[PDB]
Design a protein around this ligand. Structure first.
Ligand SMILES: Cc1ccc(NC(=O)c2ccoc2)cc1-n1cnc2ccc(N3CCN(C)CC3)cc2c1=O
Length: 347
């Protein structure tokens, strides 16, 4: 067991192993504050998130367990991984604090915004990342530029997947961003699958190509209006699939937009880039390209290697459907701290 040391970094008492040095706060991550630090053990720059009141409620408690489970499972270049997890607690009884340590990528995709080859590389890495998380039946749900971490090599990792609530029957505290959300999760108007994340990739890729937010909607309805202006009102075959009677009512009432020519919207874009965008930004949940299929699209010829696009090990999210006391979520998280083994360090 290591020696810890305490400091006050903006409201909060950080208590961390002596191994981590020169903590300097960089803002909020998912459910708590993040410090940049220096890892004396590895010589590396790391990010330390202190979860804010991890065990105040069932929601915080379950979400704490979820995040730690998520992180401990991901092992892939384009998906953030767990370098370390720790507590100052010396027993389960006094266990009150969780700190999660990952690599510090220099930046995220806001800060960056770009040539076509740059967009190829970055979107390529996102889809390579999504294939792996999708293959474990995990869905990001709020993929967006601020949770795409990038270093100066344009090497990219996805953060914060799997947190934004599954249905509207649950609350996880996590706040999504309107502009990158698939119309089906935003509005809950047909069922949804992993391709909610492909819609997002569509929106991010477009933005990288034009500098403009694709759909800067000011609310749910304005957002839906912006979207239909580009893709057109849904056809009779799409209407067939809308499960809600109010959504279908609303749509069939809007005065009808035609689908536009994506070439006349993405003018000056590489035509392969345009073709992919048309395959990503389709209303129909069953028709939208998947991560795997997008990886094989001509746009990515320079990057695609079927033998280096791995899938994940099976991930057991049966805990998701359980209804347990705060102390039960709490002890489960404790087990997961104690059993943590850090990634191997070669020379
Ligand atoms: C350190 C850390 C620990 C855990 C998690 N959890 C997940 O990614 C995740 C995946 C599934 O569920 C949760 C993420 C992080 N993490 C890693 N690196 C970061 C780098 C920078 C920042 N900040 C960038 C600047 N911004 C103003 C505030 C956030 C933030 C971060 C940042 O939050």
């Amino acid at each position: 067991r290591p020696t810890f040391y305490r400091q006050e970094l903006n409201k909060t008492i950080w208590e961390v192993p002596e191994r981590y040095q020169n903590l300097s706060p960089v803002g909020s991550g998912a459910y708590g504050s993040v410090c940049a630090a220096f890892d004396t053990k590895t010589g590396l720059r790391v990010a330390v998130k202190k979860l804010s009141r991890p065990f105040q409620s069932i929601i915080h408690a379950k979400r704490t367990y979820r995040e730690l489970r998520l992180l401990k499972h991901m092992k892939h270049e384009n998906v953030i991984g767990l370098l370390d997890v720790f507590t100052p607690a010396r027993s389960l009884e006094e266990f009150n604090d969780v700190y999660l340590v990952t690599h510090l990528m220099g930046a995220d995709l806001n800060n960056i915004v770009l040539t076509d080859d740059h967009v190829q590389f970055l979107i390529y890495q996102i889809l390579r990342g999504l294939k792996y998380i999708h293959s474990a039946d995990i869905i990001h749900r709020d993929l967006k530029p601020s949770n795409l971490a990038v270093n100066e090599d344009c090497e990219l990792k996805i953060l914060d997947f799997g947190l934004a609530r599954h249905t509207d029957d649950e609350m996880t505290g996590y706040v999504a961003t309107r502009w990158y959300r698939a119309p089906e999760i935003m509005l809950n108007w047909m069922h949804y699958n992993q391709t909610v994340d492909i819609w997002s990739v569509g929106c991010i890729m477009a933005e990288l190509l034009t500098g403009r937010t694709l759909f800067p909607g000011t609310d749910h309805i304005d957002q839906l209006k912006l979207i239909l202006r580009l893709v057109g009102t849904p056809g009779a075959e799409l209407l067939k699939k809308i499960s809600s009677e109010s959504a279908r009512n609303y749509i069939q009432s809007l005065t009808q937009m035609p689908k536009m020519n994506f070439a006349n919207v993405f003018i000056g874009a590489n035509p392969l880039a345009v073709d992919l965008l048309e395959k990503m930004l389709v209303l129909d949940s069953d028709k939208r390209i998947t991560a795997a299929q997008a990886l094989a699209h001509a746009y990515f010829a320079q990057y695609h290697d079927p033998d280096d696009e791995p899938v994940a090990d099976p991930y057991d999210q049966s805990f998701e459907s359980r209804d347990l006391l705060i102390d039960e979520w709490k002890s489960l998280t404790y087990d997961e701290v104690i059993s943590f083994v850090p990634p191997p360090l070669d020379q």
